[PDB]
Design a protein around this nucleic acid. Structure first.
Lengths: 175, 188, 175, 188
RNA sequence: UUUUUUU
RNA sequence: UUUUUUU
RNA sequence: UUUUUUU
RNA sequence: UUUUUUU
């Protein structure tokens, strides 16, 4: 036979698309070691925006590290990398992953400027909501090592920001 | 005029998403099969349900032999019976994608939800058709890929307090389904 | 002087617009007399959709009366009219207002078909959210009289349905 | 093939919404006035506030004499002082329309929110400018009509536990405002 | 419906 | 820098 | 950065 | 009606 599945042809005008922006704080770092993996498509916050639609696609997406007033005196290490969600790499293997970055935040000259790390949406699947579920959407891995004698306030914040294109309203009730 | 941001670049490579390659090997033969299924006998007691077309037991007896199944046409129909004139019955229904969170008791709170009064002497006992829009809802109820937006019908019905013993109307769905790609099953 | 206020010229591309549909049940009628006035722009449900944007305009809007299984035996009167929100007319003066309609639902032949009453958006201000507040947005007035010996279940439902065009995201927090 | 709906028509008439008619009577003379206002002295204790430009007491002393006031340019600036090198201070800020529900403690959870580390030996004590985008935010802070989307600045600052007695930096806003249409006030 | 708005 | 003056 | 994807 | 056959 050989008839898996594609879509029927778009009937008329394609549905209108709107972009909604967002910025989310994933973590406050520097007071203790930290390591997590964040699957963007499963994020609680983004889900509230996509709940009303059938199609949601990331337009731009990036992670930013913002050093705070405690970074100068308490150098902190932050490593991170973007991988498709089906990758099995863990937060402790960032430097063993192609493209993995490790930064030294604070202590030395010029080391308090914020850092941007864009996610390459041509290397990661940007569709986080559609007629079917995808397995290769963006996942961010991050690892952080803090000073043994740590501060009581974070040395930096890790956020992600971007824009999602939303389209095709998903019928829901008003109640 | 320096900027206050450092840009770090994560090395890229040539890696892309993918689905199913093209047919170019002889597009499979497609057959169209008709059906009419009675979903419910209403009017003897209140009733409410949600019917996911892709999960329906009866329709599945036809699609079980194939790997691909796509609706060509689909509609719900309410057929008043000999008990409708004396026992007016309420029937409300709406068609939504299967991933909608709407429930059978919220038909009138959903865009497009309809509520009808079936029976009543003064009324009409003409049957009513409500077509499913297959350009909004995804018509592919069976494929290599699982889709989440296939047709789901929500319905609610309220019966007279002092109800009849035979139904006042029947709710059925009817259409034609395009089938292709035999799926090996046993014959025992 | 004589310099009240207009807007500065649209700089570049106009912002994208999306339409979101809705249907809301305003009332279950026929079990007792009822009378209310509904200011659309102040509606709780619609507010949840417009909360994320700066501009919201009604595209289509109508009221529908849906007779139920109790209408045949319990004729009910329903009167309604659409007026700008700054009108001081009350629900009991529908027939004393230009365009006011009064319907008899149930009891007689052909009287169980649902009824649509579209709101004229060229006679009412469709902008329910913008840079300033408007005073002439849609307001629906409705009145209903029930049988003295009323049923325990409603004889009809009053709903409103339409679509709102939303645009220009309003910056909000993710928290 | 009859439909199951009755359409009722509400009689219409010629009635439309309206605002302000055109100027054509001699467009009023507009003057541009410059300003620089210190909003806060930071670094001696934690601080957080929300400043609605249209409600600011100081800026209002200039706009009180006119009926129309529109920002031509506007920016916030952080100026490190002689105490910044030894007492690093955190300052976060973002510009939002006045009708935004975001609060000063949610700067980093708002699209565009910035957080800076001021001071620190290794650091730089160069002043920082953050321009307000007057094409996103409504620049008309005073008019015949009241607008809800004028510029609002949100800021948060965290100081060292063992803080200095003099501020580590000053936060100010600066720009030019176009004024027109004298508004009669008393001179006493 | 108590239909004369959308030039 | 708290850069929109020098047409 | 541990930069060779966007033809 | 539970209307998509008669090219």
């Amino acid at each position: 036979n050989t008839k898996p599945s594609l879509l029927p042809p778009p009937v008329g005008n394609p549905p209108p698309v709107i972009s909604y922006p967002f910025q989310i704080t994933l973590a406050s770092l520097g007071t203790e070691d930290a390591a997590d993996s964040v699957s963007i498509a499963s994020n609680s916050v983004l889900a509230t925006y996509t709940a009303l639609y059938r199609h949601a696609q990331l337009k731009h997406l990036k992670a930013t590290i913002h050093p705070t007033y405690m970074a100068p005196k308490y150098p902190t290490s932050v490593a991170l990398v973007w991988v498709p969600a089906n990758s099995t790499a863990t937060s402790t293997q960032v430097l063993d992953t192609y493209g993995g970055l490790h930064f030294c935040i604070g202590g030395s000259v010029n080391s308090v400027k914020p850092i941007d790390v864009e996610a390459n949406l041509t290397n990661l699947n940007p569709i986080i909501k559609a007629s079917t579920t995808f397995t290769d959407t963006p996942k961010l891995l991050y690892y952080s090592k803090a000073q043994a004698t740590a501060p009581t306030s974070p040395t930096c914040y890790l956020t992600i920001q971007g824009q999602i294109e939303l389209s095709s309203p998903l019928l829901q009730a008003s109640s």
